[PDB]
Amino acid sequence: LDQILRATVEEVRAFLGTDRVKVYRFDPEGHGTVVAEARGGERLPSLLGLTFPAGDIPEEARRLFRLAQVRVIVDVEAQSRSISQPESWGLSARVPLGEPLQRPVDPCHVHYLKSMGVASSLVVPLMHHQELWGLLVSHHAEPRPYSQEELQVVQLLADQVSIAIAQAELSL
């Protein structure tokens, strides 16, 4: 699995040429590990082999990853603002899909990325419909907005990858 993913992040990155693209596996406890990381160069430190703090993924958001497989952070310049204080939640039948087009992100995570030297982050999961094995995230040091064309690229590869991680798991 590791070898496959590592090969996936390196090759895919070459196509996106994005400052940094990595795969993030989710552990039932929340302790996920970087099993795939690509970088343009020694410009941005490598987070490979490092462990992220458990709980990095909130509650309302993580549930969306399982429901809509669609998340992205907008240019910090436009300064999207949000509050970690949501009103109730949707029902099983209802599937909330970013009511607004600006889907503002609370400041806590925005400045967090600023600390990472990132302005806009895109997320295109590499997993199943009702089950999340991991998450893919791309970093672009530009205030430019996200385009559907970007989705076209990962849509075909992500689906083939999400399948790879699923098929590879059977080995063990």
Ligand SMILES: *[C@@H](C)[C@H]1/C(=C/c2[nH]c(/C=C3N=C(/C=C4\NC(=O)C(CC)=C4C)C(C)=C\3CCC(=O)O)c(CCC(=O)O)c2C)NC(=O)[C@H]1C
């Ligand atoms: C601050 C109190 C907390 C918080 C809230 C929060 N998180 C997001 C957005 C995202 N979080 C990430 C982070 C990652 N990038 C990575 O490199 C990795 C792998 C190690 C992760 C998991 C990203 C890219 C997202 C998804 C984009 C999105 O906006 O959904 C959100 C949005 C959810 C919402 O609207 O409430 C917020 C506001 N982040 C924390 O970790 C807490 C400390």
